[PDB]
Amino acid sequence: GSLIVVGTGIESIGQMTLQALSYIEAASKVFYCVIDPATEAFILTKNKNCVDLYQYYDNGKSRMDTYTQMAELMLKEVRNGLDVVGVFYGHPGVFVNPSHRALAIARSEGYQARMLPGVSAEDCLFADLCIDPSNPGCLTYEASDFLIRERPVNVHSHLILFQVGCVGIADFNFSGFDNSKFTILVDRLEQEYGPDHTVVHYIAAMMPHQDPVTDKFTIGQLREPEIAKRVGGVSTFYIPPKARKDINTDIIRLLEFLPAGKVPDKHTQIYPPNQWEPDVPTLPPYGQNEQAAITRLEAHAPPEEYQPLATSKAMTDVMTKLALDPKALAEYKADHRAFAQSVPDLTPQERAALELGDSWAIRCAMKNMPSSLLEAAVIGSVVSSA
Amino acid sequence: GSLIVVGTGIESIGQMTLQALSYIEAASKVFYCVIDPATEAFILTKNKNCVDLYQYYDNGKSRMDTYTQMAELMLKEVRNGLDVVGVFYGHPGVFVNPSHRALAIARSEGYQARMLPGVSAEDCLFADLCIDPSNPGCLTYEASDFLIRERPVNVHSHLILFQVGCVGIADFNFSGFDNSKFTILVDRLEQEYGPDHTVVHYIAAMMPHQDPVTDKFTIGQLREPEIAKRVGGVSTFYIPPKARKDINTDIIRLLEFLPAGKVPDKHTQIYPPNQWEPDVPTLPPYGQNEQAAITRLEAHAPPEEYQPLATSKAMTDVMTKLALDPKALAEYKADHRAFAQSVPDLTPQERAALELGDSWAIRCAMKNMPSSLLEAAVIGSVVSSA
Numbered sequence: 001g002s003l004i005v006v007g008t009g010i011e012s013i014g015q016m017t018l019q020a021l022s023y024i025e026a027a028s029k030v031f032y033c034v035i036d037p038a039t040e041a042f043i044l045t046k047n048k049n050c051v052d053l054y055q056y057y058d059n060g061k062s063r064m065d066t067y068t069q070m071a072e073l074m075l076k077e078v079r080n081g082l083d084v085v086g087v088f089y090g091h092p093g094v095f096v097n098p099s100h101r102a103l104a105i106a107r108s109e110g111y112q113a114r115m116l117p118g119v120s121a122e123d124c125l126f127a128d129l130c131i132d133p134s135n136p137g138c139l140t141y142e143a144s145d146f147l148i149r150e151r152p153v154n155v156h157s158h159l160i161l162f163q164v165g166c167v168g169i170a171d172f173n174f175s176g177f178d179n180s181k182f183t184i185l186v187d188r189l190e191q192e193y194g195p196d197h198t199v200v201h202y203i204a205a206m207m208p209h210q211d212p213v214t215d216k217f218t219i220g221q222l223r224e225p226e227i228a229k230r231v232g233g234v235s236t237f238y239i240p241p242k243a244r245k246d247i248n249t250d251i252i253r254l255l256e257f258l259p260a261g262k263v264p265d266k267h268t269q270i271y272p273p274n275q276w277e278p279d280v281p282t283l284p285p286y287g288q289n290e291q292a293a294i295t296r297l298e299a300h301a302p303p304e305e306y307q308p309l310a311t312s313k314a315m316t317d318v319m320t321k322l323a324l325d326p327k328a329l330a331e332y333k334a335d336h337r338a339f340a341q342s343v344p345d346l347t348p349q350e351r352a353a354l355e356l357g358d359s360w361a362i363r364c365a366m367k368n369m370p371s372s373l374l375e376a377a378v379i380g381s382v383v384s385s386a
Numbered sequence: 387g388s389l390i391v392v393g394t395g396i397e398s399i400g401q402m403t404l405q406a407l408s409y410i411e412a413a414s415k416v417f418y419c420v421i422d423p424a425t426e427a428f429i430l431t432k433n434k435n436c437v438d439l440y441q442y443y444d445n446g447k448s449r450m451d452t453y454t455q456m457a458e459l460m461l462k463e464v465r466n467g468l469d470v471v472g473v474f475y476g477h478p479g480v481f482v483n484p485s486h487r488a489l490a491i492a493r494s495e496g497y498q499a500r501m502l503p504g505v506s507a508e509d510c511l512f513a514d515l516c517i518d519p520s521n522p523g524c525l526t527y528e529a530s531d532f533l534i535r536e537r538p539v540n541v542h543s544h545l546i547l548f549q550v551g552c553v554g555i556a557d558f559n560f561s562g563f564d565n566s567k568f569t570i571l572v573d574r575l576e577q578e579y580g581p582d583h584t585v586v587h588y589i590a591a592m593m594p595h596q597d598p599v600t601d602k603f604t605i606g607q608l609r610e611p612e613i614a615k616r617v618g619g620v621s622t623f624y625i626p627p628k629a630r631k632d633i634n635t636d637i638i639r640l641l642e643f644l645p646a647g648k649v650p651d652k653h654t655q656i657y658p659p660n661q662w663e664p665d666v667p668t669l670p671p672y673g674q675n676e677q678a679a680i681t682r683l684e685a686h687a688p689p690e691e692y693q694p695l696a697t698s699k700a701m702t703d704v705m706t707k708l709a710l711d712p713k714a715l716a717e718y719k720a721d722h723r724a725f726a727q728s729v730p731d732l733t734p735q736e737r738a739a740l741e742l743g744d745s746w747a748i749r750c751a752m753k754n755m756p757s758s759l760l761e762a763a764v765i766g767s768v769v770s771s772a
């Protein structure tokens with residue numbers, strides 16, 4: 001037996017990866033927890049043997065018990081010698097208890113266990129809010145865990161909080177959560193950021209035609225019942241930096257990031273600014289260096305050492321096959337020589353490269369195939385803090 | 387004109403989302419920065435008009451200049467009235483300057499600008515290391531920015547560092563980076579975590595048959611030239627928690643997470659443990675509560691209020707179409723009535739639901755279609771700290 005756990009992303013159907021889909025298709029048995037009905041419907045057309053894990057939540061039932069069951073249902077089948085696929089919406093290991101639970105148990109018992117990544121709600125937040133986690137660093141917490149364990153804030157970096165809709169709730173209810181302890185989360189955020197600092201209420205669109213909720217509030221507004229009512233089981237908070245941290249220009253020098261003895265402006269960031277953030281000194285989009293780079297584009301030719309793609313249909317076909325056909329990949333991994341020998345239309349260099357399996361060899365083969373004469377010459381909580 | 391920016395994920399071809407692929411296909415013009423040759427080859431079969439952005443890096447050329455150019459090339463075409471698709475490997479907004487740069491400029495100039503999320507190397511790290519960012523919180527930094535701005539560590543939460551392969555390098559070289567300031571990063575990590583704490587050197591597999599590098603070291607080992615040589619342009623560091631933070635059992639009480647006047651054990655975590663972490667008191671996989679939940683599965687029936695999927699082929703088809711056909715989605719968004727009227731085989735409830743467009747209506751329609759008589763009765767650095 002074996003367990004593969006895959007994701008579906010957040011927005012229905014379209015945010016599923018190609019490999020997630022091919023593993024769902026190849027499974028003996030599929031267990032899924034998805035919250036968009038069209039994704040569910042899609043999944044059912046792809047495998048004849050699926051079980052909805054959502055039926056294992058209940059009113060007044062500890063989510064922890066639900067997660068134990070979701071994990072055991074998959075493990076039963078793995079122990080029976082089946083190739084099971086677990087499917088969880090988003091990324092299946094981001095704020096999901098039973099995926100990790102089932103995988104760690106499977107691994108302990110000596111079964112093949114693999115998780116494939118997906119697009120998380122945080123990934124969606126980056127995209128819909130056009131923020132880059134690198135500028136100026138990103139800290140992500142579960143909201144109750146943030147409270148429970150008094151986890152430190154970082155006011156100079158992005159803050160993302162999941163499960164703001166179920167603060168201190170160990171439970172479930174089909175009617176939704178009664179987020180009565182929400183006020184405690186606001187207290188903490190006010191203590192850390194002040195009632196006037198920005199909080200974005202974020203809900204990624206689940207249907208392709210839907211708009212994201214990207215509502216800019218102040219933390220103090222979260223105390224108003226009309227505002228607070230809208231934060232539910234699919235709500236995430238984004239808290240922008242309160243201030244930026246100075247560049248340490250002496251560390252700049254030590255790293256020799258810039259020419260010797262030079263200094264950047266300590267207070268200024270790179271274009272673009274973060275829309276959701278209070279004003280920060282930011283470089284203009286088209287200063288001297290940018291104009292120089294743009295005027296230089298006219299003179300541009302590809303550098304000597306740049307090597308363009310130079311492959312064939314047959315090579316492109318086999319690589320595509322290895323990515324999209326789990327069976328063919330398992331065959332290739334079991335025996336590189338036999339598999340490579342069977343591939344149609346491969347050049348002897350392509351063949352040998354595939355035979356070797358080395359990343360260097362394959363990359364070289366795909367850049368060295370001559371093409372011209374010249375060249376040849378909504379309640380989906382799947383984790384709990386408790 | 388318009389700009390859509392999409393990702394390809396990390397592992398070749400298979401980690402591309404369905405929507406990324408459909409937007410690449412529909413584009414007038416495609417600009418791409420991908421580092422796996424098979425993904426490049428795949429992309430070229432999907433659109434007839436592509437430009438490789440990789441040719442805009444050069445030896446001794448400031449990456450910032452490269453990013454200015456990558457962004458301007460896309461913006462030129464947007465200004466010409468084209469529907470441009472920018473493609474960046476991974477998630478196109480995670481540690482990527484020019485995507486954000488081009489989008490913010492496009493938006494300022496009044497063009498339609500959208501980023502679609504993808505699978506990041508961090509998403510891959512979660513999956514390959516089976517860690518959950520929620521336990522016990524996740525902090526992500528760019529490595530040079532971590533140094534430059536003396537960003538605080540959090541020894542009780544996960545730490546992820548990108549671009550460990552190019553510390554204090556503003557530059558590029560086709561032969562790879564000369565990571566001479568790497569030692570400065572080690573100094574900081576030793577200062578914060580001690581020479582004996584774990585660091586995982588992580589490289590997600592780029593080819594479907596490749597294994598990830600998931601090498602467990604101590605921070606002190608990073609000083610050895612034989613170890614340090616292997617950290618390159620696609621290297622990420624994972625630093626597990628040094629210790630766990632106590633539950634504050636008085637905050638537990640305030641949130642009424644558990645029955646009144648009850649207490650959990652302050653020092654104990656939920657199963658499973660984190661493989662990469664030093665020993666932590668962890669609950670066993672099958673204690674009393676888990677066995678209770680499992681024996682209870684035998685008695686299990688779906689709760690009264692659980693509503694199984696109950697839709698039709700025609701509805702599933704149209705929802706699938708809206709997810710996978712950008713043109714059909716644009717048509718639907720332009721006019722809900724006319725589009726819904728045109729859809730084959732829709733039930734009048736399905737029709738009206740599609741006409742309304744409301745998430746509630748569509749979800750209700752997909753759970754209320756009766757099916758029985760009873761029921762009817764390698765150098766890819768795309769960001770810089772500078």
Ligand SMILES: Nc1ncnc2c1ncn2[C@@H]1O[C@H](CSCC[C@H](N)C(=O)O)[C@@H](O)[C@H]1O
Nearest residue numbers: 090091095120121162163203204234235236
């Ligand atoms: N459409 C959506 N928009 C914003 N956040 C969402 C969301 N769906 C789920 N979430 C976040 O995820 C939490 C449930 S945990 C499930 C997360 C999912 N595995 C993922 O990859 O993101 C919610 O409480 C919320 O914080």
Ligand SMILES: Nc1ncnc2c1ncn2[C@@H]1O[C@H](CSCC[C@H](N)C(=O)O)[C@@H](O)[C@H]1O
Nearest residue numbers: 476477481506507548549589590620621622
């Ligand atoms: N195969 C791989 N494995 C691990 N980390 C990787 C990787 N490819 C890229 N990275 C990380 O990404 C950095 C370049 S920034 C590009 C990141 C990409 N947009 C993404 O979504 O992840 C590298 O320095 C490294 O830290």
Ligand SMILES: [Zn+2]
Nearest residue numbers: 265266267268
């Ligand atoms: Zn200044």
Ligand SMILES: [Zn+2]
Nearest residue numbers: 651652653654
């Ligand atoms: Zn104890």
